[PDB]
Every structure is written in C-alpha cells, then in structure tokens.
Amino acid sequence: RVTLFDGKAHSVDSSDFAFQMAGALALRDAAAATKINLLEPVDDVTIVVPDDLVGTIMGDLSGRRGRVLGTDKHDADRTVIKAEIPEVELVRYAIDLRSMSHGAGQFRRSFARYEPMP
Amino acid sequence: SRIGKQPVPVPSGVDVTINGQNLSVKGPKGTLTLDVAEPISVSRAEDGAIVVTRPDDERRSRSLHGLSRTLIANLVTGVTEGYTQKMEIFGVGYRVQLKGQNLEFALGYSHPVLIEAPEGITFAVESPTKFSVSGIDKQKVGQISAVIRRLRRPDPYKGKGVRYEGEQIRRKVGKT
Numbered sequence: 001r002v003t004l005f006d007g008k009a010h011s012v013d014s015s016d017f018a019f020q021m022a023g024a025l026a027l028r029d030a031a032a033a034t035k036i037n038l039l040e041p042v043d044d045v046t047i048v049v050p051d052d053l054v055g056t057i058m059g060d061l062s063g064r065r066g067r068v069l070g071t072d073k074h075d076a077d078r079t080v081i082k083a084e085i086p087e088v089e090l091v092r093y094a095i096d097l098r099s100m101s102h103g104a105g106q107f108r109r110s111f112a113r114y115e116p117m118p
Numbered sequence: 119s120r121i122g123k124q125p126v127p128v129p130s131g132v133d134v135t136i137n138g139q140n141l142s143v144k145g146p147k148g149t150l151t152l153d154v155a156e157p158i159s160v161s162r163a164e165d166g167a168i169v170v171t172r173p174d175d176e177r178r179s180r181s182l183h184g185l186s187r188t189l190i191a192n193l194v195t196g197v198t199e200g201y202t203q204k205m206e207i208f209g210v211g212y213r214v215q216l217k218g219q220n221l222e223f224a225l226g227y228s229h230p231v232l233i234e235a236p237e238g239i240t241f242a243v244e245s246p247t248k249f250s251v252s253g254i255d256k257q258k259v260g261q262i263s264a265v266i267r268r269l270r271r272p273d274p275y276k277g278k279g280v281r282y283e284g285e286q287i288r289r290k291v292g293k294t
Contacts (some may be wrong), residue, residue: 056293099294 002027039114040086047081047097047107048074056100057081064089065118084112122183125167126191129198134168136160141190145197147254148238152193158186168194192256201259202252205266209278213246221249225270226278236262 007022045066049057058068061083072080085093090109097105128134133144141152141160154160154170157179161169170187172179207214213224219235221243235241239253239262251266253259263282270279274290281287 002030038117040088040117041114042084042086042112043090043109044069044082044084044112045090045093045107045109047083047105048078049081049101049105050077051079053101053104054079054081057097057105060096060100061085064093085109086115119180119183122170122172122180122187124187125163125169126187126194128166128168128194132194132198134162134194136162141193143193143197145194147197147200150193150197150254152189154186154189155182158182160186160190196254196256200252200254201256202250203259203263204248204250204283205263206281206283207247207249207279208281209276212278214243214249215246216241216243221266223269223280225280231269233262233266 002023004023009019047057054071058081061068064085066083066085066089069082069084072082074080093107094105097107099105129145131146135142135144139153139156139160141154143150143152157172157174159171159173161171163169168190170183170190172183174180207223209226211224211226215222217232219240221233221235221241223231223233225231233241236258238255239251239258241249241251243249251259251263253262267280267282272287273279274288275292277287277289
C-alpha cells in the first residue's frame with residue numbers, strides 16, 4: 001500500500017511524466033528504507049516408492065528441506081509420499097530419485113503456492 | 119600369572135620329553151618341539167601334567183609365565199586333536215576348488231589365483247563356496263588362514279570376498 005501524503009511541484013516545470021518518475025523514485029526510496037520480502041514458490045510432490053526405501057527418500061527430502069505431509073500405502077509394496085518441496089530443490093530431483101530408487105522412483109508435482117525464503 | 123599356575127593335563131596317548139629348556143611332544147597327529155625362556159622352569163608333574171614355574175615376581179618373568187603355559191597347552195592339544203578352521207566365499211562367480219595339494223580361487227580377477235600348501239597343512243574344500251584349512255600347528259593354520267582372507271580387499275557395499283566362519287563384517291551403503 002502506497003500513501004501519498006505530501007509533495008512539491010513547480011508552476012511551469014510540473015508534468016505527468018515528472019510526477020510518474022517522482023512516484024517511482026519515492027517507491028524505490030521507501031523500498032530502500034526497509035527490507036524486501038522474497039517469495040519463492042513450492043510445488044506439492046506425490047511420490048510412489050517401495051516401502052523398503054521409505055527412510056532413504058525421507059532423509060533425502062530432509063536434506064532437501066521438504067515438509068512431509070503423510071505416508072499413504074499405495075499398495076502392498078509401495079507407499080505414496082505426499083510432501084511439498086520448493087521448486088529449487090526439484091530441479092534435479094528426478095535424476096537423484098531414480099538413483100535413490102533403482103529407477104523405481106516415480107513422482108508428480110504441481111504448483112501449490114508462494115512462500116518467503118527461510 | 120593366573121594362566122601360569124594352571125598345570126596342563128596330558129592325555130594318555132601323549133609322550134612328553136624334557137631336555138633342559140627344550141620340550142618335545144609326540145601324539146597321534148605327529149610330533150612338535152618347543153623351547154621356553156630361561157627364567158621359566160618346566161617340570162613333569164607326576165600326576166600326569168606339566169608345571170611351569172617362575173622363581174621371581176618381576177615383570178618379565180610374570181609376563182613369560184602365562185605365555186609359556188599357553189604355548190605348552192596349544193602344543194599338546196595340537197597333536198592330540200589338531201586344528202581346523204573353516205572359510206566361506208560370498209559373491210557371484212566367486213569359487214574355490216583344489217588342484218591336488220594346491221588351492222585355486224576364482225575371485226573376479228582376469229586370472230585365477232593359486233595358493234600352495236606349505237609343509238604340515240592341508241586344504242579340504244567342501245562346496246564350491248565353503249572350504250576348510252587343517253593342520254596340527256595353530257600358528258601356521260592362522261597364518262595361512264589370514265593370507266587366504268586377505269585375497270580380496272574388504273567390500274563394505276556388496277560383501278564379496280572370502281570370510282571366516284562366523285565373521286560379521288561391517289557394511290555401509292553406496293546410495294548412488
């Protein structure tokens with residue numbers, strides 16, 4: 001929210017473009033007068049992996065700052081893992097997972113929301 | 119010390135000869151010879167045993183006491199019964215088979231590896247993955263068993279190689 005409470009102008013040297021620039025510079029100064037919050041997106045990831053590798057993937061997500069939401073039994077031998085991971089950590093998630101899984105690693109992602117950087 | 123004052127029983131079929139410091143033991147599995155250190159005195163307990171005695175209580179004699187006693191005990195139990203230690207081999211394509219006295223191993227090398235049988239010891243393979251080493255002398259059996267064990271470097275990941283009977287090796291995981 002921007003609240004213009006005062007200002008100055010010239011009888012001859014006042015123009016709409018000049019006031020546009022003045023408002024932009026005032027906003028820039030206000031931004032430099034405080035801190036700026038950076039918001040990064042997070043994508044929910046649902047992964048199907050065998051139950052024998054649950055701990056390894058959970059710890060890998062632990063090193064990936066992932067927030068575990070729940071471990072759902074996909075079937076008698078695989079568990080669906082629901083978790084939201086920042087998109088930065090998912091750039092090379094697939095290759096490492098196929099590693100963490102003898103390729104067995106299958107997952108889907110979808111944008112969830114934006115959150116500030118920790 | 120505590121081991122030292124325990125006399126060593128002699129089985130019936132065992133012949134024991136003492137010549138000064140020297141000792142010789144003859145039994146069903148063969149003959150063996152030993153020598154004890156000067157401060158330690160060896161005697162034939164007439165009730166059918168061996169007695170080792172240290173005149174002093176100083177460090178060197180007290181250390182040599184139990185050493186000599188255990189050496190004599192191993193000496194007699196080698197000829198009365200013997201020594202036999204068992205080995206297994208783990209992994210795919212890892213095999214053993216005997217060529218007469220010699221022992222032949224396929225350990226994933228480009229070439230097969232061979233081990234001679236030194237004097238006074240024999241190899242007996244039971245299955246292509248399980249074999250045994252037998253001899254009358256404990257020290258030589260242990261030496262050759264260690265040499266066999268060192269054939270392939272430790273493998274914490276897949277556990278391939280030659281292992282002792284009940285050995286529990288440490289293992290880690292290569293995740294990638």
